[PDB]
Ligand binder design. Structure first.
Ligand code: CL
Ligand code: CL
Ligand code: CL
Ligand code: CL
Ligand code: ZN
Ligand code: ZN
Lengths: 339, 340
């Protein structure tokens, strides 16, 4: 009988001299042609990408012509690809995207939530009675969905539904990019009420490598993919925002590194100039582990660019300080990433 | 005297989405009776684990044994707060402030630092009413008020009470060694979130320590009495141990007066069932609170299988639904069959 191997320990969290907690996980690094550069752990069992694949889901917004018809630039494209903090800049831009399609917050079907970022949440609490759908981290993606529908005269009502034309189109796009089979059996409902399709990490990484390089893509999809990847790297605040790893990681080497977090410990990334796509998951779903793992994986490709490498290693290995500012331990990606 | 077998910890908690397991947690559980006999276990219960806040009731023994709690007229709410990782609600803050003032001190005596509530609803209330939190809002402020009170009652200068060789920390090591039978020293010590020592020890020893506090077995009369007072106070005033929305408080409302529980940072739980002579400790390998919560409920449930209403209420913590922002059920967080 075959079985699945136990995932290796990818991240340790120390206190004093001891490992206090440990995370296991898996990483796939795939080039534009589909060759596996590097991997750790189980890259074949299907994993939910959650928000990490928002740039794939943003392809309808661009390919439909809607982004151009509505005058969207890199900030709107980045927001369409974002799990944003719900800061005022994000909420205003989502509202503007909807308004250009003749719609408003009432068209959003994602629901509302308070910021998961503590400083932004404090700001929101002090200025709002309750968040609205615009504050949802997925509001730019859903504004992008609504814009793709309205530009094409598709009724956006029910755009979250499995057989709404928008979800039909997103399945076709993601199957083409990743080569995975996306069906009801491997589908769940995402935090924002749209389908999320579990697929192998190997396929997810391959899909990001294709977006990053154009390999295997028809001309319009290759061009739209470049636009999205470049918009995210050009306006990284709009992908995440203040205090956030995705934003800071895309400020290390401006215009060269694409990253995107997903809920439950997922990260996707790409390095266009190296032809590389990356996907990963921390087995237990911890964000702190996925962040350390994506920085340590990226660092493998910048070892001779000392300033970039040092900045990535500062996310791969990070100090923890207590409320008095005393160093108590570290969160560190393990040696499997440098071997 | 060869070395024990190494172990990979089993999957104790699954998090599903749709038809699939989305995330998984591994961990370990020790259940020990008052005599030190191992009653049930899963995973590695012998490698040292930091208990973090889960052992606050052990650290509260100086407050009671010194005579300070009685000298200051404290009741169960103050004892519970001394044992608490509280939410920083107004009642917790006011009670820590009055424990300090009854000892002739104030917020400036606290050496733990300040933080915003880890509970989101309380955070929102704090943000709307405060420019910044103070040390009284720290989840450990009742414990640290207890420390300061223990010092002041005995005319021990509380300044520097976080330090490794302050008399209070010397006393805490002696208490915790007696209760747990573990060796506590600098090599197995770290600094806690509140700046005091935290000592790694095997889950087996931590569970035994809670079984001893719960039963009195192996303890001298004053320590057995003080331990009863602390465990009873937590069960009597469980809001003061944690607060609104919190697992420790809700778990202590299932079977009033019968189940003691306490969370610790990084996925630790300790528990006791005094009437059954049982102490419990556990850790999620990755540190996730959601896993530790499911594990403590599934472990407790094994002791109440013939008490259907208590069992059902515990099972609702062992397997909990997850809903998205629209209220749609997306999956569940469930303790696995290793608990059966
Ligand atoms: Cl969700
Ligand atoms: Cl294509
Ligand atoms: Cl800490
Ligand atoms: Cl004793
Ligand atoms: Zn979403
Ligand atoms: Zn503490």
């Amino acid at each position: 009988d075959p079985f699945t191997m136990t995932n290796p320990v990818t991240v340790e969290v120390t206190r004093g001299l001891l490992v206090e907690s440990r995370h296991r996980g898996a990483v796939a690094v795939v080039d534009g042609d589909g060759k596996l550069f590097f991997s750790l752990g189980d890259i074949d069992t299907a994993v939910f990408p959650r928000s990490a694949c928002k740039a794939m889901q943003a392809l309808p917004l661009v390919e439909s012509g809607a982004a151009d018809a509505y005058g969207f630039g890199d900030k709107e494209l980045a927001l369409a690809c974002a799990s944003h903090n719900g800061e005022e800049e994000h909420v205003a831009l989502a509202a503007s995207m909807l308004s250009r399609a003749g719609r408003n917050v009432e068209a959003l079907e994602c629901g509302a939530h308070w910021s998961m970022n503590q400083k932004v949440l404090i700001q929101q609490a002090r200025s709002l009675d309750a968040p609205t759908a615009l504050h949802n981290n997925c509001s730019g993606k859903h504004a992008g969905f609504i814009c793709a529908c309205c530009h094409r005269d598709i009724d956006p009502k029910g755009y979250v539904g499995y057989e709404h034309p928008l979800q039909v189109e997103i399945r076709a796009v993601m199957e083409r990019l990743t080569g995975a089979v996306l069906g009801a059996e491997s589908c769940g409902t995402d935090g924002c009420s749209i389908p999320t399709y579990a697929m192998p990490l190997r396929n997810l990484a391959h899909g990001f490598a294709r977006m990053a390089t154009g390999t295997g893509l028809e001309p319009l999809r290759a061009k739209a993919s470049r636009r999205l990847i470049e918009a995210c790297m050009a306006e990284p605040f709009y992908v995440a925002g203040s205090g956030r790893a995705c934003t800071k990681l895309m400020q290390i080497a401006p215009g060269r590194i694409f990253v995107k977090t997903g809920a439950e410990g997922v990260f996707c990334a790409a390095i266009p100039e190296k032809g590389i796509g990356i996907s990963l998951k921390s087995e237990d779903g911890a964000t702190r582990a996925a962040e350390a793992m994506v920085a340590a994986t990226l660092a493998r490709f910048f070892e001779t660019e000392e300033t970039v490498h040092a900045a990535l290693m500062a996310f791969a290995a990070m100090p923890m300080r207590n409320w008095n500012g005393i160093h108590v331990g570290d969160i560190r990606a393990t040696s499997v990433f440098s071997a």
